[PDB]
Design a protein around this ligand. Structure first.
Ligand SMILES: Nc1nc2c(ncn2[C@H]2C[C@H](O)[C@@H](COP(=O)(O)OP(=O)(O)OP(=O)(O)O)O2)c(=O)[nH]1
Ligand SMILES: [Ca+2]
Ligand SMILES: [Ca+2]
Ligand SMILES: [Ca+2]
Length: 341
DNA sequence: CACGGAATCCTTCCCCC
DNA sequence: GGGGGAAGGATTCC
């Protein structure tokens, strides 16, 4: 069983470099401007020249400028990156019929058929890196191992622009050596709950009564970790299908007035519909971000699909429902469409 | 200062043989 | 008791 994971390097910034090579070499910051004020917002990503100084995904744009006042700051252009992603995905297709697109810049390939051993797998890796660099002029990192999880881990260890195989002898040392927090699907909240249980390495999950683990982190999560420890994890590669479309925007000023929010809300639905393109949702959820950055949501499923008129109508009630049950002001508002026919 | 988007799981109902 | 779902939220990752 051989899985090959591909992850494009500093993707949004690298695409910006390709479309305008003059940028290459200098610090490049792709930002998301919220408009609340001059430079309000966050950094989507940054090229390496910028990450070596602390500027990275998540930090406020205002904070990134204090560190690199002279870098190049660019607004994020999803559509552009998405189409480039799509083309790159189509290059991988020509390497396996078994392909799972995980995000806008990640994909897993089941090359158990094609390749025979790890040596060949590695070479196929180089062929893919090479192909993509030539066609799209974009570098990516490749990770190869026994299953998806370790393939991805392989990639995190080899970036940027690397390629790495984590052979069976290593999996075993990683299950013992590797820090549980560096395992995909284990964020802060979980790692923290894991420390208390004395688990700092994948192996520790075997020296704990399952039921206490489940109690603390959930069954799904407990079975996941345990199978990994037992070197038994092996979920297949499957094409994922879009299960929900939505849009959320920041208002210029926090508000509680329905008439002040409606406009932002309607625009959100509009864009969402354009994005649905042919798809018809049965469920609609209204999502609100409270002034103290907490998230509130109210939704509804219908026994049939939702027309745009219906969406406008029903979204106002859920927004009214929200305000009636929460007293904080609202900072961000949006909609989520799901359960496609 | 803290954006925008989406999947998946966890709980708590709630209806009902 | 337990199947079946819908809601609202928790949690992770891009
Ligand atoms: N708006 C927004 N976009 C994000 C955020 N995090 C990631 N993205 C984008 C950043 C990247 O361009 C793309 C994800 O790839 P990461 O897996 O994020 O890789 P990135 O390419 O930035 O890092 P790397 O290639 O490993 O050096 O998704 C975020 O918090 N907000
Ligand atoms: Ca990644
Ligand atoms: Ca990446
Ligand atoms: Ca982590």
């Amino acid at each position: 069983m051989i899985v090959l994971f591909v992850d494009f390097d500093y993707f949004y910034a690298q695409v910006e470099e390709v479309l305008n090579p003059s940028l290459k070499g200098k610090p490049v910051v792709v930002c998301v401007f919220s408009g609340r004020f001059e430079d309000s917002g966050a950094v989507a990503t940054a090229n390496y020249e910028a990450r070596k100084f602390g500027v990275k995904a998540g930090i406020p744009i205002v904070e990134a400028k204090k560190i690199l006042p002279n870098a190049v700051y660019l607004p994020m252009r999803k559509e552009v990156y998405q189409q480039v992603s799509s083309r790159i995905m189509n290059l991988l297709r020509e390497y396996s019929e078994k392909i799972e697109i995980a995000s806008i810049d990640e994909a897993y390939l089941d090359i158990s058929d094609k390749v025979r051993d790890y040596r060949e797998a590695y070479n196929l890796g180089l062929e893919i890196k090479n192909k993509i660099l030539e066609k799209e002029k974009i570098t990516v990192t490749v990770g190869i191992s026994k299953n998806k999880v370790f393939a991805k881990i392989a990639a995190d260890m080899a970036k940027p622009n690397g390629i790495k195989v984590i052979d069976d002898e290593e999996v075993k040392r990683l299950i013992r050596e590797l820090d549980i927090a560096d395992v995909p699907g284990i964020g802060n909240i979980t790692a923290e709950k894991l420390k208390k249980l004395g688990i700092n390495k994948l192996v520790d999950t075997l020296s704990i009564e399952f039921d206490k683990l489940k109690g603390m982190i959930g069954e799904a999560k407990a079975k996941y970790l345990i199978s990994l420890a037992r070197d038994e994890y092996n979920e297949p590669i499957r094409t994922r299908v879009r299960k929900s479309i939505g849009r959320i925007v920041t208002m210029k000023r926090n508000s509680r007035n329905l008439e002040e929010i409606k406009p932002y809300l309607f625009r959100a639905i509009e864009e969402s519909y354009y994005k649905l393109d042919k798809r018809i949702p049965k469920a609609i959820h209204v999502v609100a971000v409270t002034e103290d950055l907490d998230i509130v949501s109210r939704g509804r499923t219908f026994p049939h699909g939702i027309s745009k008129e219906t969406a406008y109508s029903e979204s106002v009630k859920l927004l009214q429902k929200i305000l009636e049950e929460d007293e904080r002001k609202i900072r961000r508002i949006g909609v989520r469409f799901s359960k496609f026919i």
